[PDB]
Each structure stands twice: as C-alpha cells, then as structure tokens.
Write a protein that binds this ligand. Structure first.
Ligand SMILES: C[S+](C)(=O)CCC(=O)O
Ligand SMILES: C[S+](C)(=O)CCC(=O)O
Ligand SMILES: [Zn+2]
Ligand SMILES: [Zn+2]
Lengths: 380, 380
C-alpha cells in the first residue's frame, strides 16, 4: 500500500534514547489499533460476521433497543480496511506517526505528574499538566477538573477488558499510550456544555486521526476517515444532548459499581419520539423528556453485554452518570474507547441541543429538560 | 590460597577440542563472577562503600522501603572475599570447575534446541531439552513450560545492564554461559508451588555453588557459602510467599515494559505487619494481605533504581508478575542474577507458606490470600 501522511507530519530525527521512547509509544499504539480492529470484526450477540452494536437505545415503534452488526456500515468497513493496511505495513504507517511533542495547532495535556510518571515517554514529551490548568481556572469548574485529574489513574483503571479484548487496552495494559497521548479538556471553556462539574470533569484523547499521533491522510488514494482514541467523564455528571455529522463508535471500558452507574442514550434524528420540522437545509428537532419521559431513552452501559454503540449521522446522544450509586461512590466515572469513522468529510463540529427555555438554565441542563436541536444536512 | 573442591568434583581428561569448549565456559563464568563482585562492591544510592540494597519493601514502623549497604553483612563480605580469591588464582579455582556433562545427582536441562545451538559448548554438553520435558508433561503446566522454553532467548534478552554492570552479564553478552549452565524446572513437580503457569513458567540455574559448575568446598579453611546463578520467571504469574534459612540476593536484569511489570516483596519474619507465635524450635507467621492490603508490600523492580535486594534469614518474599502490561505483553517475564550467601550451613530447603484453611486452594494462591509460614530457627 501507499501511505500519504497529513500535511503537518514533518521529518523528525531522534537520539538513540529518544527513539526508544517513540518506539514504545508506537508499539502500544499498534496494539490499540489491532485490538480495535478485532473489537469491530469479532462476532457478538446474534451477528455472525462482526460485532453487534446498539444503534438506538429506544426505537419508537418497538419500544426496545435496536442493534446492527457494525461491519454492515460501509464507513466501518473502510476503517477496518485502513487499520489492516496500517498493521500489515507498520514501518510505512510509522512515517505518519509522531509524539506531538511540538504540536502547535492547540494545547495538548497530561492529567497530572502522577500520570506522567507512568512512562519515560510521557515525561520526555512534557505536556502541560491539567492540574496546573484547573488550579488557574479556579471555581467549581476547577474543583471538578482537579477531582478528575488528581485521581485520573484510579478513575481510568476501574475497567474490565476481559470479555471483548484479547489484550488489556486500558491504562493498566497500555500505560505508555494513555500517559503520552494528548488529553483535551474539550468542554472546560464552553458555557453551553451545561454544568460546572461536567465541563471540568470531561477529557478525551486521539491516538489516530487528523489530530492524533498517527495522522494518515490517504492510503492507496482513499481518504482515511478513522479517528480513534479514548474518553473519560467524571461520575455524577450529566451532559446536554449531542449531535454531529460524523458517525461515532463507543466501546465502554468501565466496570460499573452498580447496574445504573453509566447510562447512555442514542436515538436517530428522525425517531418519532421527537418532533421534527424541516428548516433551510436541515431539521429542527424538539426533545421533550419531561415528566420522566426521558428515562426510557437511557440504557445501562457495561463492558460485557451493553458495551458497543454505533451512532449514525446526526443521531441524538447523551451520557448520564447521575443515577444510583453515583451518589455514594468516589473517583469513578465513564471511560471508553472512542472513534469516528468519517473524520475527513462534512462538519466535525460537536453540536449541543439548547434549552427550549433559553440560555438562562443552560447550566442546569439534564435529560428531563425540553431541548431544541438544530440539525444541518450533510453532503452525500 | 588453598582450594578444596567439593566431594563430587572428579578429575577428567579432555581432548584438545573438548578442553577448548570447557575453557570458553570457564572464561564466561569468570566474567560473570567478576561482574558479580563489582555489583556488590560498587557504591550506589547514598551508600559510600558498597551497593545500596532493598532489605524490606515495607517497613511497618515507617511505612516505606528499607535499605542497607550490602557489604555491611558479614556473609556478603565473605562472598566477596571468596570471589576475589577465585579471580586472583583462577587456575587453582578451575580445579573445582566442571561442565556437569555427566552430573549424577539430578537432571540438568537446556531450554530448547535453539538455545542449545547458541554455543558449541552447549551442543557438546547435550543436556536433555525442556521443550521435550514439557511436551511429555502436557496440560497447563506443559503449556506454560513450552511458552517459556520455546521463547527463552527472547524473554532472557529483554534486559538492560548498562547502568550497574561494566560487561553485559545477560544471555546477549555471555551466550556460552547461559546456554551451557544447567537449567532446573524447580517447581514443575511441586503441587504446593501454586498455579500451573507459575510451575511450568519457572527456571533457575547455578554457575557457582555446591550444585553448580564451580564447586569449591573451602578456601583457606573457610567454607564457601557463595551460590551464584540466574533465574527466569514467565510473565503473568504469581508465586506463594517464600522463606528459607540462607540469605539471598537478587539483581534484576529485565528492562520492564511498564513500571509495574515485575514486582517483589521482602519483609523480615518479625515485621509487625504479620502475626508471630513462637512454635517448637521456630515461629508461626500469619500473613493477611486480603482486601488490597498486600499491594503496599510489593515494590516495582527494574535494572536501574530498584535493582538490588538482600533477604535476611527466613525473610518472607515473593515475585509477582500479574499487574499492568502483563495483561498485554508477550514473550516476557522476570530475569535476574540470583545468589545465596550461606549455601553450606543450615537448611537449604526453599519453604513455601500455605493457605490458611484446608478449603483454600494452592493452585490459586496470590499475594492477597491469607497464608501461614512455619519458620524454623537456624543455628547461631
Ligand atoms: C469529546 S469527543 C472524543 O470529541 C466525542 C464527544 C461526543 O460527541 O460524543
Ligand atoms: C533456588 S531458587 C529456585 O532460586 C528458590 C527461589 C527463591 O527462594 O527465591
Ligand atoms: Zn458524539
Ligand atoms: Zn528465596
């Protein structure tokens, strides 16, 4: 195969010792991507040829969850094809890999000195620390950011990978990877993202994709849409409803402490539980989960049975960690392997549904509050 | 100096070709022993006159590791004294060396044909192969033994000796030594030794000592206690707690792939973490590491910082390779330079702590399981 790297991949030269740190980063990245391929292709449930993914937590006509075998989607097929080419010619793909030590586009972080201490690679990369970031921010956002990042190892180690992975892909099994990838406080600066705790208590990182460590633009003339990484959301937080053009996959790693520790919702934009109105090149979708109506839209997540979910384009989705033992546990949360399949086409912006009532209660947004989602059409 | 060999050292005539093969073995043995001497005597840490050794991974009064400058121990001073005499008059000491080609006391092995082929000496010695030994045994012990011995060179080559050794003592630098010494599956036939994978996945060999290639009984009327060799323990294994009369020294060669790949515990018999009751001519020591209490007793091992440990008489110890990247790595383990200092006095038996109850299973013992150690007094 012929790899064309992204345009911000630059020639690099390392000392003998530095190259060992980069090679360990690369090797664990390759394990992550081989396990990712196996997670897609290994059959589960009643699917004969690939993994059974939840595509709607609540189908309006059936009143139950809806699944699909994940390799039925052409975009997922292409992700698998590109991972296979990467893994078959790793020396070629590695031309497109760098540790993002001097990445200028935007800041990338490491949670804490403790996390940094997990690997010589992470100490050498020397990203700014999120403990420093949230000390400067202060307030309730800073308190949530400190709770997550000062306890990041413990939160992210509460995982069970034994059923759907043949190698531990968590921070315990791949500590150089998790300690060295660029972590991003994606909601800390966004007032529309809801509560102070959710904004300070959310992080994600990208191993592979247009902004990750492995940045391949094309393989054999095909645009690489794969964007793979991880996410971490502190316990006792709720987020507003989300939607976006790119299709998205989540594999839950967290071993819950109670059955309803981690709940999630995904429903297609044209689901009859919502009200739709055509708009200039899009849809206005009204969501009304008031008076307990929201509860049936949310399903419990775990790393064995309800572990895999696939979001079609503009599907409405949310992650909810307020119920049950979230009111008593400590240093806990929701931790996933995350991906998007079409990162190089359409609009990648993560959109948030807004209060039907207005910016005023934007901070107290939960799944029971009536919301409005302004969807845009995508290009075929 | 005057050397008196052990009683099973016999005179043997060699052809010119055989003597050459014996000589190469002896020459690498002398390098191994000279490096051993330097590892004891070269100051490290805050020790001014000799190497800083860990003697307790967890002191109960301080809650921290405890160290000692290793030449403060009179038995270590005597190993150093006797190594110096060997190195000063190697022709005299060579009278007590033989390749154990026809050693009668018990079987000695070579891991595999591949390892055997690493040196003309080992091909000539023609030990029985552990690949053959474990094919016959079969089952889960045999599967572990084959995994270790089919991949012996890869496992034992994952070493970094640059910091504390001036010549590489690993298989990569002394291939005749490592391929020719007699390897022993010390736990393969011991039903008390714990899991089937630990039992098949353990090996040690003895260069110098009462059962080694160099078998000196006395130097200048002093009994030589020195017993020096190497150990290999396959990854993803744990062993029961150990104890024994002879003092013991471990120098870690494996370069870990995660900071917690290779963990060890050593705590003196009278450590207040345990409960002691005076028994007949000994001490009953009860150990309770349940509910995570064991974790603080175990320290990470590497060849640079926590590379040297010294076990006082009857000190409880264990080596634990279940954590972290042991759930992700392959063809890996823990490899050490091993020694005992008083191999000619008291009871040399390696003792194992047992499960607290009759219902408790040996095949599952891990550091977290309550255990009972029946210690015997030594002769002062
Ligand atoms: C925070 S991420 C990794 O951009 C994905 C968030 C989402 O849209 O679900
Ligand atoms: C003689 S052995 C097989 O090294 C005993 C192992 C130990 O007690 O550390
Ligand atoms: Zn999303
Ligand atoms: Zn021992």
């Amino acid at each position: 195969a012929q790899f064309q790297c992204q345009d911000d991949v630059k020639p690099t030269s390392y000392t003998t010792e530095e190259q060992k740190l980069v090679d360990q980063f690369w090797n664990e990245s390759l394990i992550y991507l081989d396990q990712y391929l196996k997670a897609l292709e290994t059959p589960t449930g009643q699917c004969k040829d690939s993994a059974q993914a939840t595509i709607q937590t609540y189908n309006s006509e059936t009143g139950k969850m809806q699944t699909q075998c994940i390799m039925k989607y052409r975009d997922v097929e292409l992700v698998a094809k590109h991972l296979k080419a990467v893994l078959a010619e790793p020396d070629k793909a590695k031309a497109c890999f760098d540790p993002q030590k001097n990445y200028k586009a935007f800041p990338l972080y490491t949670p804490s000195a403790h996390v940094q201490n997990l690997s010589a690679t992470s100490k050498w990369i020397n990203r700014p620390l999120l403990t420093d970031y949230y000390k400067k921010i202060g307030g309730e956002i800073g308190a949530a950011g400190l709770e997550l990042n000062e306890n990041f190892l413990e939160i992210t180690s509460r995982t069970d990978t034994t059923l759907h992975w043949t190698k531990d892909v968590s921070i315990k099994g791949l500590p150089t990877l998790w300690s060295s990838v660029g972590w991003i406080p994606f909601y800390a600066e966004n007032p529309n993202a809801g509560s102070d705790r959710f904004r300070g208590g959310y992080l994600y990182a990208e191993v592979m994709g247009p902004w990750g460590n492995l940045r391949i633009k094309e393989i054999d003339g095909e645009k690489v849409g794969a964007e793979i990484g991880m996410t971490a959301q502190l316990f006792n937080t709720s987020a507003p409803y989300h939607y976006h053009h790119p299709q998205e996959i989540y594999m839950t790693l967290t071993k819950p402490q109670c059955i309803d520790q981690n709940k999630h919702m995904v429903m297609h934009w044209d689901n009859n539980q919502f009200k739709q109105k055509r708009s200039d090149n899009g849809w206005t979708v009204n969501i009304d989960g008031s008076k307990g109506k929201w509860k049936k839209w949310f399903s419990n997540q775990d790393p064995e049975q309800n572990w895999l979910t696939y979001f079609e384009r503009n599907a409405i989705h949310a992650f909810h960690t307020l119920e049950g033992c979230n009111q008593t546990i400590k240093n806990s949360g929701l931790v996933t392997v995350w991906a998007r399949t079409t990162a190089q086409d359409n609009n990648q912006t993560t959109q948030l549904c807004r209060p039907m009532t207005g910016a005023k209660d934007i901070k107290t947004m939960k799944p029971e509050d009536k919301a409005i989602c302004d969807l845009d059409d995508w290009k075929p």
